[PDB]
RNA sequence: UGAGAAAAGCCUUCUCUAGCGAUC
């Protein structure tokens, strides 16, 4: 139940406390982020699972990344990218991998995963995504063109 | 039963049992079994859709977008705040129900009423306002549903004479009203 | 903690470029394209993207890898130049 | 792709020979020290000869 | 996102590679990357499963709001 | 190292001050998504 | 057998399966 969610929140804690070190975020903002992260985490660890919960989780993390990106330019602080941004991107990649494993037939989820890998992920991670796509969706010529186009 | 009478007289809507459990949920649009499987986001979406539909027919509803159909109203729960906040909420809900009363037979008004019942529990806190809103349509069946939402079992209650139309599922007769 | 077996295991998903090496030619279309490339100088596969199983021909191949790396930096630098112009 | 394609593969599996579609899948997604599990001993020998 | 390449930025070809299917032809991406379709479907499917139906005014007695488990059994 | 820590504390206070006075309209849209709309006063 | 026997309406405690969840 809450043991896995607790593990994930304690994993999320260090980048939040580093953000509090930055001065990018205030303590009440950290509390609100923790609360909403726990609320979103509780939905995707249930016995009955829906795709929209995964979509909302991914969208919330993307919005948090965008907010951090906007605030870093105003502050002028460019250090500690790896401590926060890479951790968030790794968590989002794990969420995408679980969602794609659960629902293989949904092409739209695969394309959203490809788009996020293009925007935020290393090129080799995007390379692995196309191989997973073409392995089970080799009967669609358009997907072959998109991989060759990239 | 003297202790039982004292306890049942001491009962208040704030300390209701349904606040602390999801076994039963009151809903105007759905049966309680399906109503207990609805997330707050879905009910908020239904309420916003109903209000957006209502805005087309009548503009003057826009003032209800902020206090009742926004994120602040989404997070707000009445039991946590003080009596002054509840009084201001009562004024806002009474005004919105006065505005809703002409359009009650339409579906968007039913969606907005469903969102209000889901979020603010107006069937417990604002019985008089709801009855005033729904009373001119006592010959309809949606009136019977709204009455079935309320709890009027006690014979000393103000609205006890409306008990049979809840128990039998029939509209109120005009002769009884007269 | 000790993990057994001691031998390491490769990651589950190959990143496309490793997979491209394994394929050969059997279609007549592939044969002509295969033949025209080797009679000339152009390689079939990207050397830096596609790893190979770990004298003079190795030395010139290393020079080819250095040139291929040089073009990638040149294209990136030219891409950086146009990005700076659009920012301005 | 089609029912006629499926019927051709069904005959090849019964005879124990390797159809062109089967080799196309095997060559593409198998790295080339590989253990392959098959239900028929005859098709296993045929694959080991071709690949 | 569908067609935004750096080759478009640095012009090297007259025209680009065209995939036949487009995002607009499909339902569209599930997420937004700048400053909902499943939510309307969930709302619409939930709306169809409502006690208030056509001929609701036609029926003479409203079905009971709630039943005890013993009576249902 | 105590004086070094006191130097960092004021740096956090200086960064926190600058992020609150001026906020663009796009940022306020983002903060409602990330933090919600809750008033405790 | 002997809180006699018989029938209706409410709470309390608990038993079985069946999907579902474990793929990062």
Contact indicator for E19, E25 with CB cutoff of 8 Å:
no
Tell me, yes or no, if D32 comes closer than 8 A to chain C by beta carbon: yes
Contact indicator for A116, A65 with CB cutoff of 8 Å:
no
Tell me, yes or no, if B75 comes closer than 8 A to chain F by beta carbon: yes
Rounded distance in angstroms from the CA atom of residue A116 to the C1' atom of nucleotide G18: 40
Angle of CA points A68, A72, A74, to nearest 5°: 125
Q: Tell how far CA E67 is from the center of its chain.
A: 34
Say if residue C5 is preceded by a cis peptide, omega within 30 of 0.
yes
Alpha-carbon distance of A72 to A89, in angstroms, equals: 17
Alpha-carbon distance of B21 to B76, in angstroms, equals: 18
Residues of C with CB under 8 A from a CB of E: 78-79, 82-83, 86
Q: Tell how far CA A119 is from the center of its chain.
A: 11
Largest Cα separation within chain E, whole Å, is: 77
Q: Which nucleotide is nearest to A98 (CA to C1')?
A: G24
Residues of A with CB under 8 A from a CB of E: 51-52, 55, 58-59, 62, 107-109, 111-112, 115-116, 118-119, 142, 145-146, 148-149
Alpha helices (H) along C1-88: 17-22, 28-39, 56-87
Contact indicator for F37, B72 with CB cutoff of 8 Å:
yes
Output the six-digit token pair for E70.
Answer: 């013993």
| B137, burial (CB in 10 Å: exposed 0-12, middle 13-18, buried 19+) | middle
Rounded distance in angstroms from the CA atom of residue B148 to the C1' atom of nucleotide G16: 36
Rounded distance in angstroms from the CA atom of residue B43 to the C1' atom of nucleotide G16: 37
Angle of CA points D1, D5, D7, to nearest 5°: 135
Q: How far is E47 from chain B (nearest CA, A)?
A: 8
- With an 8 Å Cβ cutoff, are C13 and A128 in contact? yes
Largest Cα separation within chain F, whole Å, is: 41
Contacts of A122 in chain C (CB under 8 A): none
- Number of Cβ within a 10 Å radius of residue B163: 16
Contacts of C13 in chain A (CB under 8 A): 128, 131-132
Alpha-carbon distance of B133 to B104, in angstroms, equals: 8
Interface test with D, best of C25, C26, C51, C52 (most D CBs within 10 A): C26
Residue of F nearest to A56 (CA): F33
Experimental technique used to determine this entry: cryo-EM
- With an 8 Å Cβ cutoff, are E9 and C78 in contact? no
Alpha-carbon distance of F32 to F39, in angstroms, equals: 12
Q: Which residues touch strand G (CB under 7 A)?
A: A 4, 47-49, 94, 97-98, 101-102; C 12; E 68, 70-71
Alpha-carbon distance of C36 to C41, in angstroms, equals: 9
- Three-class secondary structure of residue C4 per DSSP: coil
Alpha-carbon distance of A109 to A115, in angstroms, equals: 10
CB nearest F16 (choices: A23, A66, A74):
A23
Angle of CA points C52, C57, C60, to nearest 5°: 90
How far are the Cα atoms of A22, A111, C83, E67 from residue E6, in angstroms, in the given order? 34, 19, 10, 65
Rounded distance in angstroms from the CA atom of residue C53 to the C1' atom of nucleotide G2: 94
Overall resolution, Å: 3.6
């Amino acid at each position: 139940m809450a043991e896995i969610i607790q593990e994930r929140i304690e994993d999320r804690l260090p980048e939040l406390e580093q953000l509090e070190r930055i001065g990018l975020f205030s303590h009440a903002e950290i509390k609100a982020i923790i609360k909403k992260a726990s609320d979103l985490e509780y939905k995707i660890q249930r016995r009955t699972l829906f795709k929209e919960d995964f979509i909302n989780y991914v969208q919330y993390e993307i919005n948090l990344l965008e907010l951090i990106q906007r605030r870093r330019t105003r502050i002028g602080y460019s250090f500690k990218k790896d401590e926060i941004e890479n951790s968030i991107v790794h968590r989002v990649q794990g969420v995408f991998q679980r969602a794609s494993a659960k629902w293989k037939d949904d092409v739209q989820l695969w394309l959203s995963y490809v788009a996020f890998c293009k925007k935020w992920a290393t090129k080799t991670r995007l390379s692995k995504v196309f191989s997973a796509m073409l392995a089970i969706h080799s009967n669609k010529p358009a997907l072959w063109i998109m991989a060759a186009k990239w | 039963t003297s202790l039982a009478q004292q306890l049942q007289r001491l009962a208040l809507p704030q300390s209701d049992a349904s606040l602390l459990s999801r076994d039963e949920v009151a809903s105007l649009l759905f049966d309680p079994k399906e109503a207990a499987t609805i997330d707050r986001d879905t009910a908020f979406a239904i309420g916003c859709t109903g209000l957006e539909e209502l805005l087309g027919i009548d503009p003057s509803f826009e003032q209800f977008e902020a206090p009742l159909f926004s994120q602040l109203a989404k997070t707000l729960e009445r039991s946590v705040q003080t009596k002054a906040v509840n009084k201001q909420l009562d004024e806002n809900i009474s005004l919105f129900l006065i505005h809703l009363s002409p359009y009650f037979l339409l579906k968007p008004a039913q969606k907005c009423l469903e969102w209000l019942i889901h979020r603010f529990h107006i069937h417990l806190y604002n019985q008089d306002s709801l009855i005033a809103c729904v009373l001119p349509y006592h010959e309809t069946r949606i009136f019977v549903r709204v009455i079935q939402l309320l709890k009027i079992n006690n014979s000393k209650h103000r609205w006890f004479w409306l008990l049979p139309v809840k128990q039998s599922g029939v509209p109120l007769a005009k002769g009884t009203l007269i | 903690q000790l993990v057994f077996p001691l031998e390491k295991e490769e990651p589950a998903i190959a990143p496309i470029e490793h997979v491209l090496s394994g394929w050969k030619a059997r279609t007549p279309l592939e044969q002509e394209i295969f033949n025209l490339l080797h009679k000339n100088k152009q390689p079939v596969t990207d050397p830096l993207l596609t790893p190979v199983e770990k004298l003079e021909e190795a030395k010139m191949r290393r020079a080819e890898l250095q040139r291929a790396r040089a073009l990638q930096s040149y294209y990136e630098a030219k891409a950086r130049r146009e990005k700076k112009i659009k920012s301005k | 792709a089609s029912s006629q394609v499926a019927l051709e593969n069904a005959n090849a599996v019964s005879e124990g020979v390797v159809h062109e579609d089967l080799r196309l899948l095997l060559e593409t997604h198998l790295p080339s020290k590989v253990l392959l599990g098959v239900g028929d001993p005859k098709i296993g020998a045929a694959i080991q000869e071709e690949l | 996102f569908l067609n935004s390449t750096k080759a478009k930025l640095l012009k090297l070809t007259s025209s680009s590679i065209d995939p036949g299917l487009s995002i607009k032809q499909l339902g569209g991406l599930y997420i937004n990357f700048n400053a909902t379709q499943i939510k309307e479907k969930k709302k619409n499917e939930l709306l169809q499963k409502a006690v208030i139906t056509p001929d609701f005014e036609k029926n003479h007695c409203v079905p009971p709001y709630s039943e005890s488990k013993y009576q249902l059994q | 190292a105590v004086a070094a820590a006191e130097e960092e504390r004021r740096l956090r206070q200086r960064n926190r001050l600058r992020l609150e006075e001026d906020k663009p309209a796009v940022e306020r849209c983002l903060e409602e998504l990330v933090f919600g709309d809750v008033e405790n006063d």
